[PDB]
């Protein structure tokens, strides 16, 4: 009850190939990292005319993370933010406290676009390099299902892991969560 406040939620409804695998719900920390949260949320709602719906997770590493958000190329080379192709690191106030914490994937300093990690273990080695902005609240078992999927040499799922639907769920009263 001492950690960051969840100010808004996002859902993803996921499929692996032609299998419906369920819903993941994230809580996002809009008081801590509003710019980074606003990007992720808008990409989830598709409200700028582009975003995560119909896109695929392109990298899965068991006992590390699953990575998605490249809705332009589906391979890690693409993606774009609501702020243009790339935007700077907002802050590093939050750490990767435990499994299910969500941060921006990047290509170095100030190269945030649309790609994100959903961590599946505590990933302290990402602290200070990747902007942490949310965490899984519900559907960690769906994350685990994706985490276990078979992959190619690029660690890309053999069967497309598709965000079949996504959007936001409003939070009337922001609530603090534990840093774990």
Pick the CATH number of 1-180 from 3.60.20.10, 1.10.10.10, 1.10.150.120, 2.40.100.10: 2.40.100.10
For residue 115, what are the contacts with CB-CB under 8 A and spacing of at least 6?
Answer: 67, 68, 69, 70, 76, 79, 104, 105, 106
Q: Is 117 a catalytic residue?
A: yes
Q: Which of 28, 59, 115, 116 is catalytic?
A: 59
Q: Is 23 a catalytic residue?
A: no
Q: Is 130 a catalytic residue?
A: yes
Q: Which of 29, 39, 40, 130 is catalytic?
A: 130
Q: How far is the C-alpha of 5 from the C-alpha of 119, rounded, in Å?
A: 19
Q: Which of 26, 57, 87, 117 is catalytic?
A: 117
Q: Which of 14, 43, 94, 126 is catalytic?
A: 126
Q: Is 126 a catalytic residue?
A: yes
Q: Residues 127, 95: contact at Cβ < 8 Å? A: yes
**Is the Cα dihedral 16, 41, 118, 121 positive or negative?**
negative
Count CA atoms closer than 13 A to 84's CA, side-chain side: 5
Secondary structure E strands in 29-110: 59-61, 65-68, 101-104
Nearest to 12 by CA among 2, 31, 26, 1: 26
Method of determination?
Answer: X-ray
**In 10 A of CB 109, how many CB atoms?**
9
Q: Residues 123, 116: contact at Cβ < 8 Å? A: no
Cross-strand bridge partners of residue 160: none
């Amino acid at each position: 009850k001492k950690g960051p406040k969840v100010t808004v939620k996002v859902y993803f409804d996921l499929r692996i190939g032609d299998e419906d695998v369920g819903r993941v719900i994230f809580g996002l920390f809009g008081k801590t990292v509003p710019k980074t949260v606003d990007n992720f949320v808008a990409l989830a709602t598709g409200e700028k005319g582009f975003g995560y719906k119909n896109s695929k997770f392109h990298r899965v590493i068991k006992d590390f993370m699953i990575q998605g958000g490249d809705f332009t190329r589906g391979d890690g080379t693409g993606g774009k933010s609501i702020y243009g192709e790339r935007f700077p690191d907002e802050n590093f106030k939050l750490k990767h406290y435990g499994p299910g914490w969500v941060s921006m994937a990047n290509a170095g300093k100030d190269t945030n676009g649309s790609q994100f990690f959903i961590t599946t273990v505590k990933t302290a080695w990402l602290d200070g390099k990747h902007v942490v902005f949310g965490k899984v609240l519900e559907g960690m078992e769906v994350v685990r299902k994706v985490e276990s999927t078979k992959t190619d040499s690029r660690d890309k799922p053999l069967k497309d892991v598709i965000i079949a639907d996504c959007g936001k769920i409003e939070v009337e009263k922001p609530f603090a969560i534990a840093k774990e």
